[PDB]
Design an enzyme around this catalytic site. Structure first.
Site, short mmCIF file in Angstrom:
data_model
loop_
_atom_site.label_atom_id
_atom_site.label_comp_id
_atom_site.label_asym_id
_atom_site.label_seq_id
_atom_site.Cartn_x
_atom_site.Cartn_y
_atom_site.Cartn_z
N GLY A 1 -66.80 34.34 -0.11
CA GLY A 1 -65.68 33.97 0.75
C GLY A 1 -65.67 32.49 1.03
N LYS B 1 -74.25 29.77 4.41
CA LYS B 1 -72.99 29.14 4.77
C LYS B 1 -73.08 27.62 4.70
CE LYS B 1 -69.49 29.02 8.36
NZ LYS B 1 -69.44 28.96 9.83
N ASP C 1 -69.64 35.91 13.54
CA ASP C 1 -68.36 35.30 13.38
C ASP C 1 -68.11 34.95 11.94
OD1 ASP C 1 -66.04 33.60 13.57
OD2 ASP C 1 -66.42 33.77 15.77
N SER D 1 -67.87 27.64 3.36
CA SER D 1 -67.98 28.64 2.29
C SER D 1 -69.30 29.37 2.47
CB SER D 1 -67.97 27.99 0.90
OG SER D 1 -67.35 26.72 0.90
C1 L51 Z 1 -67.80 26.66 15.50
C2 L51 Z 1 -68.53 27.99 15.58
C3 L51 Z 1 -69.34 28.24 16.68
C4 L51 Z 1 -69.99 29.48 16.73
C5 L51 Z 1 -69.81 30.45 15.73
N1 L51 Z 1 -70.49 31.60 15.86
N2 L51 Z 1 -70.60 32.19 16.95
C6 L51 Z 1 -71.38 33.24 16.74
C7 L51 Z 1 -71.78 34.25 17.85
C8 L51 Z 1 -73.27 34.12 18.14
C9 L51 Z 1 -71.02 33.90 19.11
C10 L51 Z 1 -71.50 35.69 17.40
C11 L51 Z 1 -71.77 33.29 15.47
C12 L51 Z 1 -71.18 32.25 14.89
N3 L51 Z 1 -71.38 31.86 13.58
C13 L51 Z 1 -71.73 32.64 12.56
O1 L51 Z 1 -71.80 33.86 12.63
N4 L51 Z 1 -71.95 31.97 11.43
C14 L51 Z 1 -72.29 32.43 10.22
C15 L51 Z 1 -73.38 31.83 9.61
C16 L51 Z 1 -73.83 32.22 8.36
C17 L51 Z 1 -73.19 33.21 7.64
C18 L51 Z 1 -72.07 33.83 8.23
N5 L51 Z 1 -71.42 34.80 7.54
C19 L51 Z 1 -72.00 35.91 7.10
C20 L51 Z 1 -73.16 36.40 7.72
C21 L51 Z 1 -73.75 37.56 7.25
N6 L51 Z 1 -73.24 38.21 6.20
C22 L51 Z 1 -72.13 37.77 5.56
C23 L51 Z 1 -71.62 38.51 4.48
C24 L51 Z 1 -70.47 38.08 3.80
C25 L51 Z 1 -69.80 36.91 4.21
N7 L51 Z 1 -68.71 36.52 3.52
C26 L51 Z 1 -70.30 36.17 5.31
C27 L51 Z 1 -71.47 36.60 5.99
C28 L51 Z 1 -71.62 33.44 9.53
C29 L51 Z 1 -68.99 30.17 14.64
C30 L51 Z 1 -68.36 28.94 14.57
#
Ligand code: L51
Ligand code: BOG
Ligand code: BOG
Length: 339
Positions: free
Chosen positions: A28, A50, A165, A34
């Site tokens: 994605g 990411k 997220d 990315s």
């Molecule tokens: C500017 C910003 C600030 C905070 C966040 N947050 N916030 C949160 C909470 C703790 C509040 C739930 C989490 C995030 N960011 C976040 O989840 N980032 C993140 C980091 C690394 C990978 C992913 N995405 C994926 C995680 C796990 N499995 C995946 C499987 C497929 C796919 N396409 C993405 C992921 C998301 C996101 C953006």
């Protein structure tokens, strides 16, 4: 100490990463970053990597990059995504321009589960118990998720759930609290509980609670269930512009959820009622929900931990891009992986 990196272009993008991560494949993409799936040779786990896009190209991006690192570095809870690793190709602050974030790969998400099978009540309990456990923790650090929806809930073959997220740039609005839809400029944690409300309902009935095709429609769909605001709540909205135009909308009574969610567990229905109240002040909190009798199989107040103090003061600072970058550099530098 410093690992050795490799390099490859994936789609339009350069991915420079430590050797330990292998078998990179894109899952994605978009304006916020990315992601690749990948195998972590150090642990033997599938991971998501990411790469943030243009992390320090504006002030907002800079603050966003810092925000996400800080937040993710702090989260340590079974039902919330955790940081396995953050790393940069750069050798120093001056070379510093790329940020990678690594977490467990999630199998898939709750949105899939909803379509491909219908769900038992014990399953519904398990799923919602875990979301509220996670939210208790997130809310304890004075973080609001704000975009809770089935696609930000990753669930594995074992039904173990983590809040995250997934966003990298099935409307969000379907789950959004009525006050957000109104650009209410000072909204609080309970917006999250509204969203859990929408998810539980969906998990029980098989379909979207409020599948609105726009913001106005969304409120219509809501008020058909929860009814037009009453006076004790109209008293809370001191805008005369507002009050008189809502009262000019033909009234709508509050439905009895018991007559709406047919053949669901009485306890689910009572909990739902507590979650989907229009007046955010009257909604059940995450802590309070975990204790409701719907989760008696699961509740344990000795295993529903809260977050460590979380310093958010950066949020109310207006800084220079190089400062946000420096600060982000420190947080990369000081990262200690979990055992
Ligand atoms: C500017 C910003 C600030 C905070 C966040 N947050 N916030 C949160 C909470 C703790 C509040 C739930 C989490 C995030 N960011 C976040 O989840 N980032 C993140 C980091 C690394 C990978 C992913 N995405 C994926 C995680 C796990 N499995 C995946 C499987 C497929 C796919 N396409 C993405 C992921 C998301 C996101 C953006
Ligand atoms: C299938 C591909 C095999 C790749 C195995 C990756 C092992 C990486 O080796 C590791 O990283 C550091 C340098 O990167 C070294 O300093 C360490 O010896 C080691 O911890
Ligand atoms: C279309 C009719 C409007 C319905 C919107 C419901 C009002 C939301 O509820 C309100 O949320 C505010 C935000 O924190 C709080 O300040 C108030 O205590 C609460 O009553």
């Amino acid at each position: 100490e410093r690992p050795t990196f490799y390099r490859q272009e994936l789609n339009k993008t350069i991915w420079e990463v430590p050797e330990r991560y292998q078998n990179l494949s894109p899952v994605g993409s978009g304006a916020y970053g990315s992601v690749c799936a990948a195998f972590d040779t150090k642990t033997g786990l599938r991971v998501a990597v990411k790469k943030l896009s243009r992390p320090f190209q504006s002030i907002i991006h800079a603050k966003r990059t810092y925000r996400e690192l800080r937040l993710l570095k702090h989260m340590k809870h079974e039902n919330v995504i955790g940081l396995l690793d953050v790393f940069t190709p750069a050798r120093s602050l001056e070379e510093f321009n790329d940020v990678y974030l690594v977490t467990h790969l999630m199998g898939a998400d709750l949105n899939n589960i909803v379509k491909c099978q219908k769900l038992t009540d014990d399953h519904v309990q398990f799923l919602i118990y875990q979301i509220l456990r996670g939210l208790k923790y997130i809310h304890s650090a004075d973080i609001i998720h704000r975009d809770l929806k089935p696609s930000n809930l990753a669930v594995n073959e074992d039904c173990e759930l983590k809040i995250l997220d997934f966003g990298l740039a099935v409307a969000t609005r379907w789950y959004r609290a009525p006050e957000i839809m109104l650009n209410w400029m000072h909204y609080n944690q309970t917006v999250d509980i509204w969203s859990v409300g929408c998810i539980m309902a969906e998990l029980l009935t098989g379909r979207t609670l409020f599948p609105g095709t726009d913001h106005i429609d969304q409120l219509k769909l809501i008020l058909r269930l929860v009814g037009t605001p009453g006076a004790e709540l109209l008293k809370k909205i001191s805008s005369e512009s507002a009050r008189n135009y809502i009262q000019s909308l033909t009234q709508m009574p509050k439905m009895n959820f018991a007559n709406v969610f047919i053949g669901a567990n009485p306890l689910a229905v009572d909990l739902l009622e507590k979650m989907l109240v229009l007046d955010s002040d009257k909604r059940i909190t995450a802590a309070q929900a975990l204790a409701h009798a719907y989760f008696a199989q699961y509740h344990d107040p000795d295993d529903e931990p809260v977050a460590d103090p979380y310093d958010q003061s950066f949020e109310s600072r207006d800084l220079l891009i190089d400062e946000w970058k420096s600060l982000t550099y420190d947080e990369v530098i000081s990262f200690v992986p979990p055992p």
